[PDB]
Amino acid sequence: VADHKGRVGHVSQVIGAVVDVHFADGVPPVLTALDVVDKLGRDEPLTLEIVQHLDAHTGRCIAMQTTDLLKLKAKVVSTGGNISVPVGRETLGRIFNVLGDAIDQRGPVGEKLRMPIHAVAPKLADQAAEDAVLTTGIKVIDLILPYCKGGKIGLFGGAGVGKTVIIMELINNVAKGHGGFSVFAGVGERTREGTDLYLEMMQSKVIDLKGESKCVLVYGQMNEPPGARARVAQSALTMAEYFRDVEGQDVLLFIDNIFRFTQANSEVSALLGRIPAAVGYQPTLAEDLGQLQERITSTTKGSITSVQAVYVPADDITDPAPATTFSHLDATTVLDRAVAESGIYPAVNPLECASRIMDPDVISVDHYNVAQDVVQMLTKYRELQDIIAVLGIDELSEEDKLIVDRARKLVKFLSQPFQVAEVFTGMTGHYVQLDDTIDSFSGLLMGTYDQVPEMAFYMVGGINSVLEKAKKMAEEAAELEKMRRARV
Amino acid sequence: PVADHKGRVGHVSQVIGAVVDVHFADGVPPVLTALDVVDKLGRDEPLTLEIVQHLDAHTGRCIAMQTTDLLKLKAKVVSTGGNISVPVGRETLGRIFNVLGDAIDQRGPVGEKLRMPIHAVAPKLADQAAEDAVLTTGIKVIDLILPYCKGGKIGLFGGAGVGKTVIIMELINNVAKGHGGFSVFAGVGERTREGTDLYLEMMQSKVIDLKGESKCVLVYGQMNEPPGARARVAQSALTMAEYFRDVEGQDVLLFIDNIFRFTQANSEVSALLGRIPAAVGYQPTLAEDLGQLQERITSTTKGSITSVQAVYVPADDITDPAPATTFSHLDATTVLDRAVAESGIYPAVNPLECASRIMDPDVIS
Amino acid sequence: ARRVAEELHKGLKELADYTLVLKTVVDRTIVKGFAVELAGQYVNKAEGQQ
Amino acid sequence: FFKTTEMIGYVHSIDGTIATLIPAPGNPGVAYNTIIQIQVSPTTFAAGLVFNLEKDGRIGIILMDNITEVQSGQKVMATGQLLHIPVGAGVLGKVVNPLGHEVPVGLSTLGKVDTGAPNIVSRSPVNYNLLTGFKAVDTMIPIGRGQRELIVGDRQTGKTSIAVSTIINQVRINQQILSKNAVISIYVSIGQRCSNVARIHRLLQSYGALRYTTVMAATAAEPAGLQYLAPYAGVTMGEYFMNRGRHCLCVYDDLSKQAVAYRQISLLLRRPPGREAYPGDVFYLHSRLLERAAMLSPGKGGGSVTALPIVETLSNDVTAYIVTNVISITDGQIYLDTKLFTGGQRPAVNIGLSVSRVGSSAQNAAMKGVAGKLKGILAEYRKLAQVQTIPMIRGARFVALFNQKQPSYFMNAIVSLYACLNGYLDDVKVQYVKFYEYLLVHRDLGIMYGTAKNKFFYMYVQELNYLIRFFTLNSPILHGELEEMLKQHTHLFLQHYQSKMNAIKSEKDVKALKNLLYSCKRAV
Amino acid sequence: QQRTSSLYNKTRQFGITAALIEILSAMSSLEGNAMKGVRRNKFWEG
Amino acid sequence: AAKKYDLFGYEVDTNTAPWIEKIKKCKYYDEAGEVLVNMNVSNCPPDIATYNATLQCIYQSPSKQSTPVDNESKFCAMMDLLEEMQHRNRLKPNEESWTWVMKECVKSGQFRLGYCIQQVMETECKGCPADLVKANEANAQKAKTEGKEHPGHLSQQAGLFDVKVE
Numbered sequence A: 001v002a003d004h005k006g007r008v009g010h011v012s013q014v015i016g017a018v019v020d021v022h023f024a025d026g027v028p029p030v031l032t033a034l035d036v037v038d039k040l041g042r043d044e045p046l047t048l049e050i051v052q053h054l055d056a057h058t059g060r061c062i063a064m065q066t067t068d069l070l071k072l073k074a075k076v077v078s079t080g081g082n083i084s085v086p087v088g089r090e091t092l093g094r095i096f097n098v099l100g101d102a103i104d105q106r107g108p109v110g111e112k113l114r115m116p117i118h119a120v121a122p123k124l125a126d127q128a129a130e131d132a133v134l135t136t137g138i139k140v141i142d143l144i145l146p147y148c149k150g151g152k153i154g155l156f157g158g159a160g161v162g163k164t165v166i167i168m169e170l171i172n173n174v175a176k177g178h179g180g181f182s183v184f185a186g187v188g189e190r191t192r193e194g195t196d197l198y199l200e201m202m203q204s205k206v207i208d209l210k211g212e213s214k215c216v217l218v219y220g221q222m223n224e225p226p227g228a229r230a231r232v233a234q235s236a237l238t239m240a241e242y243f244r245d246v247e248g249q250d251v252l253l254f255i256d257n258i259f260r261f262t263q264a265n266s267e268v269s270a271l272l273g274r275i276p277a278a279v280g281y282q283p284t285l286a287e288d289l290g291q292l293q294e295r296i297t298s299t300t301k302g303s304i305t306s307v308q309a310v311y312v313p314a315d316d317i318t319d320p321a322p323a324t325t326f327s328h329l330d331a332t333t334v335l336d337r338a339v340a341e342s343g344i345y346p347a348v349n350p351l352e353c354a355s356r357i358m359d360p361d362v363i364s365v366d367h368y369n370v371a372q373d374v375v376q377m378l379t380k381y382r383e384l385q386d387i388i389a390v391l392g393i394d395e396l397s398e399e400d401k402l403i404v405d406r407a408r409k410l411v412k413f414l415s416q417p418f419q420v421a422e423v424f425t426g427m428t429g430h431y432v433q434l435d436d437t438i439d440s441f442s443g444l445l446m447g448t449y450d451q452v453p454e455m456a457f458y459m460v461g462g463i464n465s466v467l468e469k470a471k472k473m474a475e476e477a478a479e480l481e482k483m484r485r486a487r488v
Numbered sequence B: 001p002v003a004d005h006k007g008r009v010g011h012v013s014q015v016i017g018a019v020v021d022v023h024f025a026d027g028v029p030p031v032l033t034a035l036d037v038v039d040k041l042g043r044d045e046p047l048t049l050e051i052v053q054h055l056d057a058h059t060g061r062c063i064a065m066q067t068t069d070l071l072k073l074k075a076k077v078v079s080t081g082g083n084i085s086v087p088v089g090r091e092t093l094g095r096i097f098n099v100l101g102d103a104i105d106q107r108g109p110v111g112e113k114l115r116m117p118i119h120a121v122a123p124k125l126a127d128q129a130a131e132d133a134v135l136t137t138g139i140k141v142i143d144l145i146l147p148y149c150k151g152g153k154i155g156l157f158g159g160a161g162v163g164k165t166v167i168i169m170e171l172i173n174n175v176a177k178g179h180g181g182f183s184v185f186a187g188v189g190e191r192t193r194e195g196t197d198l199y200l201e202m203m204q205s206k207v208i209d210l211k212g213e214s215k216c217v218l219v220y221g222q223m224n225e226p227p228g229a230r231a232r233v234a235q236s237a238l239t240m241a242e243y244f245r246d247v248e249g250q251d252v253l254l255f256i257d258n259i260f261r262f263t264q265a266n267s268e269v270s271a272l273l274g275r276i277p278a279a280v281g282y283q284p285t286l287a288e289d290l291g292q293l294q295e296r297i298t299s300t301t302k303g304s305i306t307s308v309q310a311v312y313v314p315a316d317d318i319t320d321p322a323p324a325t326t327f328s329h330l331d332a333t334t335v336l337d338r339a340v341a342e343s344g345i346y347p348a349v350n351p352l353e354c355a356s357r358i359m360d361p362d363v364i365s
Numbered sequence C: 001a002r003r004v005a006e007e008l009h010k011g012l013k014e015l016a017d018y019t020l021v022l023k024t025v026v027d028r029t030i031v032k033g034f035a036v037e038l039a040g041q042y043v044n045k046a047e048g049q050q
Numbered sequence D: 001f002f003k004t005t006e007m008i009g010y011v012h013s014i015d016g017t018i019a020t021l022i023p024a025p026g027n028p029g030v031a032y033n034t035i036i037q038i039q040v041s042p043t044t045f046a047a048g049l050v051f052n053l054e055k056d057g058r059i060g061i062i063l064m065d066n067i068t069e070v071q072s073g074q075k076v077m078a079t080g081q082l083l084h085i086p087v088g089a090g091v092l093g094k095v096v097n098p099l100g101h102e103v104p105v106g107l108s109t110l111g112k113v114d115t116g117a118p119n120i121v122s123r124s125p126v127n128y129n130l131l132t133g134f135k136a137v138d139t140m141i142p143i144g145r146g147q148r149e150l151i152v153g154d155r156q157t158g159k160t161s162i163a164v165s166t167i168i169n170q171v172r173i174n175q176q177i178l179s180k181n182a183v184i185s186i187y188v189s190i191g192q193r194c195s196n197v198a199r200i201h202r203l204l205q206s207y208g209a210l211r212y213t214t215v216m217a218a219t220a221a222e223p224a225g226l227q228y229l230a231p232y233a234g235v236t237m238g239e240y241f242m243n244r245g246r247h248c249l250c251v252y253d254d255l256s257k258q259a260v261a262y263r264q265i266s267l268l269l270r271r272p273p274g275r276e277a278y279p280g281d282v283f284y285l286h287s288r289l290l291e292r293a294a295m296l297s298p299g300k301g302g303g304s305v306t307a308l309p310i311v312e313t314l315s316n317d318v319t320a321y322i323v324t325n326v327i328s329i330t331d332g333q334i335y336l337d338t339k340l341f342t343g344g345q346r347p348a349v350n351i352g353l354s355v356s357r358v359g360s361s362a363q364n365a366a367m368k369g370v371a372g373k374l375k376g377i378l379a380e381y382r383k384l385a386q387v388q389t390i391p392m393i394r395g396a397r398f399v400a401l402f403n404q405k406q407p408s409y410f411m412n413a414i415v416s417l418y419a420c421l422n423g424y425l426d427d428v429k430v431q432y433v434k435f436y437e438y439l440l441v442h443r444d445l446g447i448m449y450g451t452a453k454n455k456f457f458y459m460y461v462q463e464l465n466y467l468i469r470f471f472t473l474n475s476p477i478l479h480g481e482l483e484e485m486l487k488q489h490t491h492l493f494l495q496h497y498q499s500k501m502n503a504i505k506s507e508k509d510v511k512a513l514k515n516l517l518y519s520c521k522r523a524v
Numbered sequence E: 001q002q003r004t005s006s007l008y009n010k011t012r013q014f015g016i017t018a019a020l021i022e023i024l025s026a027m028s029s030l031e032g033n034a035m036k037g038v039r040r041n042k043f044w045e046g
Numbered sequence F: 001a002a003k004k005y006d007l008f009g010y011e012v013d014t015n016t017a018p019w020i021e022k023i024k025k026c027k028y029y030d031e032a033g034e035v036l037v038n039m040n041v042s043n044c045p046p047d048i049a050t051y052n053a054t055l056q057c058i059y060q061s062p063s064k065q066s067t068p069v070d071n072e073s074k075f076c077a078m079m080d081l082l083e084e085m086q087h088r089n090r091l092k093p094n095e096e097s098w099t100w101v102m103k104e105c106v107k108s109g110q111f112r113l114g115y116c117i118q119q120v121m122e123t124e125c126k127g128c129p130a131d132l133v134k135a136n137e138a139n140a141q142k143a144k145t146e147g148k149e150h151p152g153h154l155s156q157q158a159g160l161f162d163v164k165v166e
């Protein structure tokens, strides 16, 4: 019974996407894949992955396709191993699903090997100790919550707050120019977004079907059943590990959205017959994330820079899924709906953001000192804003008003038009260098730019852009005063 | 015609609170069927049960309309041959009834000529009125600012101290005076003190003329009754109104006081059966339960039934599921304020706080 | 009913060697006619209260 | 040659709408998600959906129809097929239910309701616009064919009218252009009131939209099974046209009540409740629905199903679980604020919160010129709110023009917007904008007061709509004549009408002018 | 005041929803862990 | 002639001649639309030659359908087809395409539309056919002689308290 290739069982219960299978020769090992051989008028294959052992013969499993037209006492055959995915440089420039099958309707992959989706995470001795700054080109991200090369990054946000836009901006700024390889994992996201990304990559020739490509696209979207959405992340992560280890190549792993992974496990758990935890998530919420996140790390062989989008249901950042994810992130970026409603994009809430490389030993001393000063004033303004709400601005001290004015300029300044949101913003995108941001924010704190109008900092790049929008605003005032004189 | 399950005998299998399981050898009757506990038991009132669920091909779970005290196991139960039957006709005018359609007024036999089942399917889509029409109540405020919709639901927000009783009585008198239609009042979870006061007042205004012709029926499922009764009294009153709407083609007025107690009663019944409550703690079938009631209140091609339901907002939270679900079925809103009453304005109606959907040129002139 | 049962038996190949026994049941609903159920196959030639 | 059915077992328990079936020892057996038929009477049947096959053979059914006639101990037959509903062009102009049965109204292709959505390489960006007929929603919130656009609002804020009217606005277009480009429509009513359905049906029939529209009704009195299943059947009927190079406009009214129905069925099955007592897979309920709406690729024909889900909030709260889930699936949202609606500003589209994520690429060239500038004019207007600058004046006029009752023909809407954008309405008082628009569209002052110089650009030539849509109003071909007629119309209006309206003091005249304005506001 | 009364109502509704679930998840453990079947014992030996 | 590729790069059949034959065998011009639909469903993108045949059918067909259709217009149908060819399929209309539009305006009697098409052809194409221009002018004069130059409901004068707002 050591090898179970071809072992025959029969369906015994179908609760939904959860199917029990009885093998009379012994239930195959857990995480083993099984194929429903019996043809029952279906249009697609049915593969069930074992998730539990109920007895010496029975085993509960989750289906990676729909369980329609499946009857009890239907023949199931073991595949002889876990679900496996193609890996190698042949996968580059291709679209895959959870099962490793190509969905781009182009041709055979021709991979030299297939590797299992489920694998052990790197050990302590294999962890890396390199700390650098991944310059994104976004002022708020670069200054206050700098991203770390080879470090986990999380974008917490609500519905329609800007998670996807930021990821696309990062892909344009970093991934396209990245020498190493990239893997885009789509988990419970719109299928249209995947289509746009594939076309965008081919235009930038990051996916040269007639040449050499540098991006793999693994997609299991909302339409897919809960079983597929749970395992799609493992499949995509499997390819990234291969590039990191077997080739020692830098990898960029863009996961959108990691929350759906936890949701999918929750949906199946309710069917598996588990007592729910708080809110209704599965009791193994923490364990599932830990196993998945621990594999997303940079070892002594290679480096994986992972950017993961996190969805916060009903804007409850204390929700068990997003709340557990914070501990598994080097960099955190929290987006707030109220900030977006005020016209500030990106809607990053700097006070609730944090970074691991916000350390003078890593970033420049000036960078650390300026970043700390900005957050200190953004903390003062929040306290002052509580007084301002009820009484008013005029009920503040003379120096308090100065702090309010500087803080308001800082808040406006943090906004930036992205090159991907030109349609929404109607303005050309900006790419602010790290040095320019540091020097520009230093002056605003010093008070050197206390004579510039407030709205000159809104939707701009560096301080050069600030001082040009101010000029245009002043000139436009001459078309409102000269016209006034003409009218008078 | 007669249903085969009439006279079917069964035995009380299980008793818990107001829930009783009855075993029938020949097969459980259809759901919603009414059964009578023939066993004597030395009780003071007869015990009626209503099948709500089928546990197996022979066992059925029912809710008792009266107290289930002194009910032993194996007690004989006989089916009545159908759902609860309520008398309908012109003989019920000026009379008080309960869920079972029994005259609780001690004023002689009803002498009805026909009875109807409590549970009746709502009018089909083909029976809906061709066009919306206004209901002339005869009141200047209502007819002008918040006109009533024939076959619509009107939420009469306001408590005691604003003249709600007089407005109700005035509407009952005006509708008969102008449109020649009758009225049915349904006290769901009503304080028995206030129910007595209404009957005495209606006799003084002669909307209930004991020596003459009355123009109002009363159906009182007061608080003291178990939840199984407070969840069906409204349907019984609705059945009486439906008779006048269809057989006579009138434009009836159905008052329900309150509609929140109907939600509360049906919530308690669901809890007794063991169903998992939804958010806040109401029954999972909250939307369906109201729908099966409100949808039966509409203007058909034969007549119409315009309902004036008194709405209570729990904890003054307008987003609570009960009032929130109720508002989705209200066609008009009539708000009564004490401040207006204290100023000497009667009826005490806040014109700017009321609303109506037929306030559109496409409907009114 | 016997003729219908025999015809149904003939159609079923898997019951080739099985012998057809007939068991009568009183279906309370049907008012006129009959029905035949054999190895899942069900033919109704009955009516109910019109 | 008998019409043999397949008996599987007998009804055992009936817990409201859900039910259970005990197998008959040694009987064929049933499959998952298939449709079973409980024999209520020797000739009549009631439908149920298989939802759970248990270790003991007991089947878990969700009953759909005739649930009052279902009794324990009744035989159950098996169809052995997933629910297939009648679809095609023979179902248009009809009122049906989720099971495909026709609903009588007072005076043979089949589609599977469990089909997967198109894949990544079987889609394409939206390029063909879908006009809603409202100036606000077509300029500032463009909608394309193949897009999912949510309509979020409070109760009685006009969520249905803005959508049902869009189904009406396509009548004129469909009658002129080739039928291939016609936008057939499906209106799925989920949990609404039967009275509302009748009113909507008669409203559609009045404008003759039934030829290109079908209705799928599941009233509140109906059980949860039909409500839970209605949108899936509705989109299935729409997928028939998508897979054949044609376009559809499936509308759902509304997904909020569907979620309630699904919650009811889940709780009656005693499943772990989630946030707000909703089941964990409520998101997947809407995911598998809205994903089936797409803009198929040219290789697959180029069809489309445009989705207009509707959602109800409480006290303008857009942070609810269901509301956020749908917002996380659709490609944009139209927000109908309660305050604007109660303030007389209808349809009360809150442009500040509304957005379209993929609809800009669909906007026609003609509208894309009048919109980009309108974006700046209104953006400044909000910030500014007595000094009245040019942006403030134009912004106020635009807000007045957005007030509509019935959908506006494309030519009429774009022309009025262009006139306001170029300052032709600066001298016109705000309260008289509607009367100015009515004269511009219906009447013609240039022809009236013998001062007509144009050759072709007259607003009575309704065929110019497809020339304005091809060349853009800012074209050398149509720009010259457009300015002339606008200048003549503005000059005549200021000379004759506004001057008299400014010289009305008599109380009777004031009532006469007041009622004139009301009739103009309700008619263009 | 209107923003705080809105959150108070939203907090007294979430509270009742989330508390009834807690007490009804335990009811399923004490009920779903009531092992049953056909007990295989030497019942005569008693 | 050569390989043509779609959005993602998949090739498309270029043998549009068989479908053009079908279009030329249609009686009512709403049937031609179905052929175009079938072409796309078969991964055969229409080309300019196909559009010209379709525009010819819209001009030579008796009606849209066997039964009359309210508010049907050949001019509107043809213009929409050109918009699809230009703004969505990115194919520039040729002179023949506009000639059919001009012919319909002359045949229908919509002289005011004919004026715009005449300018359109001159601006984009190498002028306009002389015969069509002269015919269009002839239609305009006959309307002028007959007093049909404009719809007459517009000429009736009305003031402030006279308009019926309908």
Ligand SMILES: Nc1ncnc2c1ncn2[C@@H]1O[C@H](COP(=O)(O)OP(=O)(O)OP(=O)(O)O)[C@@H](O)[C@H]1O
Pocket: A157, A158, A159, A160, A161, A162, A163, A164, A165, A166, A345, A346, A417, A418, A421, A424, A425, D327, D328, D329, D355, D356, D357
């Ligand atoms: N940087 C930005 N500049 C301008 N507008 C933005 C920006 N980011 C987001 N938006 C606006 O917000 C909308 C939603 O953005 P996005 O697609 O990123 O949402 P999301 O966070 O992925 O939400 P969900 O995935 O749940 O739909 C955009 O269509 C756009 O209107």
Ligand SMILES: Nc1ncnc2c1ncn2[C@@H]1O[C@H](COP(=O)(O)OP(=O)(O)OP(=O)(O)O)[C@@H](O)[C@H]1O
Pocket: B328, B357, B358, B360, D153, D154, D155, D156, D157, D158, D159, D160, D161, D162, D346, D347, D404, D405, D406
């Ligand atoms: N654009 C509009 N102009 C004028 N009146 C309108 C407009 N849109 C809707 N109304 C009116 O507002 C009322 C509510 O409209 P509607 O039925 O569309 O709302 P809804 O969002 O569907 O609300 P409900 O929860 O009742 O379904 C109706 O009286 C309708 O005639």
Ligand SMILES: [Mg+2]
Pocket: A163, A164
């Ligand atoms: Mg997103």
Ligand SMILES: [Mg+2]
Pocket: D159, D160, D253
């Ligand atoms: Mg609605």
